[PDB]
Amino acid sequence: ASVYAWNRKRISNCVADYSVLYNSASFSTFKCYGVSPTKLNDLCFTNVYA
Amino acid sequence: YFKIYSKHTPINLVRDLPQGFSALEPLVDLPIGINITRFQTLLALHRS
């Protein structure tokens, strides 16, 4: 979607492997602010939105 | 985040609200992410 009408999707009731996101080289920028990138596999979250 | 808190109380007062204390238990945590400014309740008709 366009930036004015950005799409928001809920992620819930799943187990997420973030290691495939860090180790993938396709992303030019992988920058995290309130969480460390390497610690994402060790934490539990709810109400995740993309 | 749309929070629904609910409580059911057995009452026997005829017209107005009873006077007392009853804490509302949290019922539903709803992920909507939309703007809400106006609401309307739904009633049921009886047909004869």
Residues of chain B in contact with residue A47, where contact means CB-CB under 8 angstroms, are 1, 31
CA dihedral A18, A20, A23, A26 (to 10 degrees): -110
User: Structure resolution in Å?
Assistant: 2.6
User: Is there a contact between A49 and A12 (Cβ–Cβ < 8 Å)?
Assistant: no
C-alpha distance from A38 to closest chain B C-alpha (Å): 27
Element (H, E) at B25: strand B25-30
Instruction: List Cβ neighbours of A21 (8 Å cut-off, separation of 6 or more).
Output: A27, A30, A40
Beta bridge partners of B5: B26
Instruction: List Cβ neighbours of A48 (8 Å cut-off, separation of 6 or more).
Output: A10, A11, A12, A16
Instruction: Say yes or no for a CB contact (<8 Å) between B1 and A47.
Output: yes
How was this structure obtained?
A: cryo-EM
Report chain A's terminal Cα–Cα distance, integer Å: 12
Element (H, E) at B2: strand B2-6
User: Is there a contact between B30 and B3 (Cβ–Cβ < 8 Å)?
Assistant: yes
Specify whether the backbone of B33 is left (phi greater than 0), alpha (psi in -120 to 50) or beta.
left
